[PDB]
Amino acid sequence: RKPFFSVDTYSINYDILFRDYFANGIRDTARREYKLLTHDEAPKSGTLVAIDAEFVSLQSELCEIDHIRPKRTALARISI
RNA sequence: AAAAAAAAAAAAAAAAAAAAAAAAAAAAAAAAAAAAAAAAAAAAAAAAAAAAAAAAAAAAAAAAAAA
Ligand SMILES: [Mg+2]
Numbered sequence: 001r002k003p004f005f006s007v008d009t010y011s012i013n014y015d016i017l018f019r020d021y022f023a024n025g026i027r028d029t030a031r032r033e034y035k036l037l038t039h040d041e042a043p044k045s046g047t048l049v050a051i052d053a054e055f056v057s058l059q060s061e062l063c064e065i066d067h068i069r070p071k072r073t074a075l076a077r078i079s080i
Numbered sequence: 081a082a083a084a085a086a087a088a089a090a091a092a093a094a095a096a097a098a099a100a101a102a103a104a105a106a107a108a109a110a111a112a113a114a115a116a117a118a119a120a121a122a123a124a125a126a127a128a129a130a131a132a133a134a135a136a137a138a139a140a141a142a143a144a145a146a147a
Contacts, residue, residue: 055146073146 017043051080 018037037043054077061071 053146 049080053078
């Protein structure tokens with residue numbers, strides 16, 4: 001007879017949005033970069049960001065339609 | 081002086097009651113009266129009376145991605 005509770009009722013860390021953390025450390029192709037958030041550009045409600053992920057498939061399948069499991073993907077790249 | 085054994089094996093034996101013409105009664109309206117194996121012998125399952133079965137449930141997808 002206990003109730004459930006959400007993390008929206010809680011207090012969440014956000015600073016990983018406001019920094020980078022990566023174990024590659026090469027950080028090359030330094031273009032107009034994956035520029036880090038600060039709290040002047042802190043995220044809001046109702047606001048919009050764009051997002052695009054590129055995928056790769058990792059599964060071998062069978063014929064499956066003829067009158068080893070059906071192929072599914074995984075993520076390869078993300079640009080937000 | 082018709083005076084018989086007084087019951088094995090749970091023996092064995094009673095009935096717990098009638099046409100009534102007693103008086104001047106014709107010839108089946110019964111509802112059906114109705115026996116044969118035994119030479120290695122007769123042999124339904126499904127669930128069992130259609131006294132009224134309309135019986136295509138629309139379709140159309142121009143095509144993906146994901147640079
Ligand atoms: Mg596409």
